[PDB]
C-alpha cells in the first residue's frame, strides 16, 4: 500500500502490542474500551489471523486492514462480510456457525428457538445447489444489491 | 466448542424441504388427505405448486357453485378472523370440534398480518373440498387484491410458492359467498349492513364474482362496522361515513333493529373488529330480547401483541355457546419474511468498520 | 447500538372460558 500508511500502521501496531511480543493477542485488542462492547471483535480477529495461531502478527495486520481500502472492490468487501459468518473457514456458511454468529450480534433480543427457526429458513431458501450450506455465490445472490460494501471503508 | 455445521438448538425440528405431490395429498377417490396435509403444514412444509393450484382451483369450483347467501341449518360453529395464524387455527378445530363431525362457518379474513396465510388457505380449501356441505367459508375484506398486495399475503405467496399461486387465490377469493342465513334466524357477514341492503333479497341479487368495489353493497357487507357508541346513539343517522376504514359506513343500533324486524331476523353475526375476549354481545333489540349484533373474533394474541382471547360460537340445541381459547406457539419469522443475511449484514458492516476505525485511531 | 435489534324459545348464551 502507500508508504506513509505503512509507517503509520507500524506505529499503531506497536502501541496495541502491549507486551511488545510482535503479535497482537485478543486481550490486547480488548484493552481498547470501545472494542469491549463490539460483539464482532473476536470474529474480525479470527479473520485477520490467517495462520490460526490465535494472534495477529504485523503481516496479518496489514493485509487485514487493506481489505477496507477505498480502492477495494465490491467482491473484496462482501467476501470479508461472508468470512464473518463462515467461522470454520471452509468457504460455506453452515447452519451452526450462522446461528452462533447471529447469536453474538443479537444477544437476548431473540430467543434461541426463534433464532434457530429463522436460520433454518434462510438456509433452506438461500441454498440453491442442495448441499445444505451457503456458498459465497449464494450469499451474494441474497445481499449483493444492498450496497453494504460502500460502508466498509477505512482511512489509514 | 459448538459445532459450526450441525444445528445448535436441536430441540427445534428442521423443517422439511420436500414438496408434497398429488398422490401424497389426494387419495384414491380424489379426496384430500387432510391428516397428511395438517401434519406437513404444521411443520412449515410446502406443497408442489401444481398441487397447491389443484387445491385452490378445486375449492374455488365448489365455492363458485354456491349462492351469494348460504342457507345453513343449525348446529354450526361460527368463526371470525383468522389472519394467517395457522397454529391458532389448529387450536380452533380442537376447541370447536373436528370437521369430520362438526359443521363450520367462517366469516372471512383468512389472510394478511399473520405469516402463515397460505397454509390457512390451503388447509381450509382442502377441508371445503372434503366437506363441501358441512364446512362453509365467507369472504372477508382481506380476501381481495387491494389488501393482499398492500399487506403481506402476496409477498408470502412469492416467498413460499409463486405469484401464480397468489393469482389463483385471488380468483378463488372472487368465488367466496358473501353472507349466510343461519338456522333462519341469523344473518352472518364479515362486516355488516349497508344503506343499499334492506332485504335478504338485496344480497341474493348482487354480482359477487369480482374484486370488491370501492363503494356499494358488496363493499359494505365486507367493510362496515357498528358505531363506536352503538346502542347509545345521539347519532340519529342510521348510516354514517366510516372514518376508521376510509370507506363504507358505521351502522347504528336503530339501523340494525329495523333491519332485523323487517327481515324477521334474531341477530346479525359478524367479525371484522378485534375483541379482548374474542367476542362482543351488543345491546339487545327491544323487540327480541336478544343481542342485536354479535362480533366474533377467532385470532388469539392478534398480531402477537394484542394479548386477546379468541372465540368461536357453537350454536346447537337452542344454546349459543361461546368457546374461548388462548394463543398457541408458532414458528418465528422476521418482519416481511426478511432473511437473516439481509437483516444482519448492515449491522456487520457497521460494527466491523467501527472496530477498524477504533483499532487505527 | 451494541446489539442487533429486530426491525419494526329464546336461545340461552353460555360461556366456556379458555382452557
Ligand atoms: Ca503482544
Ligand atoms: Ca496469526
Ligand atoms: Ca463454513
Ligand atoms: Ca449451497
Ligand atoms: Fe380482520
Ligand atoms: Na398478480
Ligand atoms: Zn375485516
Author numbering:
A (entry chain B): 15 to 170
B (entry chain A): 10 to 370
C (entry chain C): 681 to 688, 713 to 723
Paper lines:
NHE1 comprises a 12 transmembrane-helix domain that mediates Na+/H+ exchange and a C-terminal intracellular domain that is heavily phosphorylated and functions as a protein:protein interaction hub. We show that the two canonical CN-specific SLiMs, a previously identified PxIxIT motif and a newly discovered LxVP motif, contribute to NHE1 binding of CN.
In addition to the electron density observed for CN, strong electron density was observed for NHE1 residues N681-A688 (LxVP motif) and D713-S723 (PxIxIT motif). Namely, the NHE1 PxIxIT motif forms a β-strand that hydrogen bonds with β14 of CNA, extending one of its central β-sheets. Specifically, in the NHE1-CN complex, both NHE1 PxIxIT residues T718 and D720 form hydrogen bonds with CNA N330. This alters the NHE1 backbone conformation (likely facilitated by the restricted Φ/Ψ space due to NHE1 P721), causing the sidechain of I719 to project out of the hydrophobic CNA PxIxIT-binding pocket (CNA M290, Y288, I331). The interaction of NHE1 with CN at the LxVP-binding pocket, which buries 560 Å2 of SASA, is essentially identical to those observed between CN and other LxVP motifs. The interaction is dominated by NHE1 LxVP residues L684 and V686, which bind CN in two deep hydrophobic pockets formed at the CNA/B interface.
